[PDB]
Design a protein around this nucleic acid. Structure first.
Length: 57
DNA sequence: GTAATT
DNA sequence: AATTAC
């Protein structure tokens, strides 16, 4: 989990954050998505957010 | 619901 | 429970 991602925080804001952890979330038979774990700087809360389909895992 | 992750 | 989207 290295390169920053443009994400929409729960607080409301657009923000360029670096995920703590990234991984692929896909069922058998389907493409699924890539997901990042992030900490909202506005609140310290944790939240998850889709990554672009070519974000490196 | 399913997939992983925490 | 949440993430996405099929």
């Amino acid at each position: 989990g290295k390169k920053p991602v443009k994400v929409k925080t729960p607080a409301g804001k657009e923000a360029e954050l670096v995920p703590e952890k990234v991984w692929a979330l896909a069922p058998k038979g389907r493409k699924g998505v890539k997901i990042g774990l992030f900490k909202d700087p506005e609140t310290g809360k944790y939240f998850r957010h889709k990554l672009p389909d070519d974000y490196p895992i």
